[PDB]
Design a protein around this ligand. Sequence first.
Ligand code: VO4
Length: 298
Amino acid sequence: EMEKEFEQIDKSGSWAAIYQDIRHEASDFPCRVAKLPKNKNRNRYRDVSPFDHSRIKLHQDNDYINASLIKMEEAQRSYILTQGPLPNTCGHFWEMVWEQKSRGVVMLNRVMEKGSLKCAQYWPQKEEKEMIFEDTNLKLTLISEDIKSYYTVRQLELENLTTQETREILHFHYGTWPDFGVPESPASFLNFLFKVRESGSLSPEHGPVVVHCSAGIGRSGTFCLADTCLLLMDKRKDPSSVDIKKVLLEMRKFRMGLIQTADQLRFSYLAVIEGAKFIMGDSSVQDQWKELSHEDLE
Ligand code: VO4
């Protein structure tokens, strides 16, 4: 059971040891397409690559994009984890969103972090300045945005200019999650996660939600681990039946390096334990997260 195991790891100060134990057991699968010379400029980070067996293929030409399908069989939820698109891969990114029928995009980083450019500016910032990705023949329009104190929700219109079919994509942009760090509180993380959940973006009627940060493994892995653990617990209505470390190891069969620090692992435990209160029927804790997260400020 998570609470007892969590209390033990703190009491012994062994989060680092628990975390390398997961690094050491994680799966190792080949990434030969990602390492092809013709794909070097499609990878943001030399050491962050999708496994061949789970990589998303574009229906083009060159089908490579740095993105992985995390298919959680038991939870019955899939996610697409991907790096922050580069200047030359923004068209690929939206082609993947289109082809995979995703409804939601979860962005856990800022475009500029810590001095450096972690993500291209791949969505329009003004309604009147739409973007056209010439190479993939898609048009992208900012329809509206709801700016909260530490995150922003945007409605975008994605249009395939070939067919002139159009889709509404929701963009969930977490603004205050430092790279290699943790959210300010479980409440602010869970308040955000439940905004994504309530949008319908995670429904099985849609394609997999697209989740990214800069590399698509650290913050992105933390978000997916927490969500999947809560969903597994929700389906069984049994918190004590969730083995978080085995869930993480299952996810790392599909993408390397998910969760980059022991403290991100520790935070995942904190989010799931707190989120269990909502899952097991204390509805009022959601509005309590909304308060603690100070979303309504500025
Ligand atoms: O942009 V991340 O270093 O949380 O994969």
